[PDB]
Amino acid sequence: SEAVKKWVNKIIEENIIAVFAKTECPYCIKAISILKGYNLNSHMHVENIEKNPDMANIQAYLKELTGKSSVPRIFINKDVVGGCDDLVKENDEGKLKERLQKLGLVN
């Protein structure tokens, strides 16, 4: 409960780019690949919450934070990006690059 929330928080707060994912999910894989395409590997953490005894608790907390329980769930500098579709929209429309520029992750 408190333990789960603290664990999720630590992932989000200690990594500039935090992705919560599940096993063999093409939208998780696509989102992570897009982010690595910006050379973000050094500041990215991917957590597979399907391989976790508390998956449902984690998903419920992600829904409390973001409005959705599904993965992938993507945070950038603690800001909610959302899922892969949200990432695609931001990427295509220049918003992702702008985010990353403000973080010094992209020129």
Neighbours of 31 (CB within 10 A): 27
Q: Obtained via which technique?
A: X-ray
Query: Which residues are annotated binding-site positions?
Result: 24, 39, 45, 47, 50
Query: Helix, strand or coil for residue 48?
Result: strand
Resolution in A: 1.7
40-43: long-range contacts (C-beta < 8 A, 24 or more apart)?
40/16, 40/100, 40/105, 43/15, 43/16, 43/17, 43/103, 43/105
Which residues make Cβ contacts (< 8 Å) with residue 73, sequence separation at least 6? 19, 20, 62, 66, 82, 83
Question: Residues marked as binding for Fe(3+)?
Answer: 45, 47
Distance CA 62, CA 34 (A): 21
Enter the tokens of residue 15.
């990594």
Provide the annotated binding site for Zn(2+): 24, 45, 47, 50
Please report where in the chains the tokens 């992570």 appear, as a residue. Answer: 32
List C-alpha distances in Å: 57 to 16, 80, 81, 86. Answer: 23, 19, 20, 23
With H, G, I as helix, E, B as strand and everything else as coil, classify residue 36: helix
Q: Which two tokens stand for residue 45?
A: 């953490």
Instruction: State the Cα angle at 33 between 86 and 50, rounded to 5°.
Output: 75
**Residue 40, number of CB atoms within 10 A of its CB:** 18
